[PDB]
């Protein structure tokens with residue numbers, strides 16, 4: 001057991017092993033706070049996420065377990081990995097705080113789209129890495145659901161990792177109005193059309209790729225309805241087949257009220273884009289999530305010829321999320337989390 005030291009930062013106590021030095025706040029939210037630090041043991045700049053009151057409720061307790069379980073499983077160059085997890089507690093009885101540690105990235109995809117003039121090759125490399133990470137995430141039957149620039153960490157060499165800050169609740173209020181929290185969402189998740197699948201993340205990739213290509217938000221709606229209309233203007237109103245898969249009868253009836261529109265010509269929307277980019281966008285930005293290209297399929301698309309290596313695009317080890325449907329008390333979620341803390345083995 002390491003020695004822990006105590007510090008206050010923005011009204012939050014941080015109690016961390018001495019190995020972590022020069023803690024500096026970088027983000028806060030309902031579910032936790034994040035600091036940058038220097039890990040004297042590895043020589044790495046790290047981010048440390050302290051969960052806020054992890055076992056205060058069943059929902060917090062289960063979220064705490066869920067993130068730990070997930071991060072412990074993620075072992076891929078394009079996905080956040082866990083360097084360390086610790087607690088100041090010496091026993092289960094004492095156990096009340098959880099801290100998670102990863103590589104500091106400090107620089108997201110927003111810090112790239114708005115600043116740099118990105119070439120087509122940059123776009124290839126960035127999207128390639130997203131899809132390479134997504135293939136891995138999706139092979140574990142994990143859906144990101146919230147893919148957007150601020151959830152993509154990018155270093156100076158344009159190396160990318162998928163993460164999820166996951167500090168915010170995603171309430172109705174949070175999804176309301178002219179907000180980036182909604183602009184990258186698949187319409188079926190935005191409007192709760194149906195039970196959704198992992199293709200939701202592909203829609204988000206299309207929105208991100210478009211924006212890297214144009215420097216502009218693809219669907220910057222001023223609200224849910226305005227965003228839907230921007231979407232349908234580009235991709236066409238739904239046909240018969242898709243309409244019946246919209247199981248929310250209310251949503252179905254609204255969408256049939258809309259004046260039918262054809263899918264636009266993407267070469268006329270993305271003027272001057274590599275025609276292979278255009279083709280990939282048309283395959284990603286498909287209204288019907290059954291017909292969207294998957295991450296594995298997209299990696300093999302000619303747009304990525306310069307990067308694709310089918311022997312270097314690994315899948316995940318089997319991930320058992322049977323716990324997701326398990327009905328447990330706070331203290332049971334807590335004891336499971338504790339087992340996971342205690343059994344963590346750091347990367348080589």
Ligand SMILES: CC(C)(C)c1cc(NC(=O)Nc2cccc3ccccc23)n(-c2ccc(CO)cc2)n1
Nearest residue numbers: 047048049063066067100101102162163164165166
């Ligand atoms: C694997 C993937 C799907 C991309 C994912 C990644 C994460 N969590 C994080 O990325 N956590 C962290 C985000 C930012 C800084 C951190 C700095 C240090 C450590 C972690 C950190 N989650 C996540 C899962 C579940 C929940 C709660 O249900 C919240 C977040 N999911």
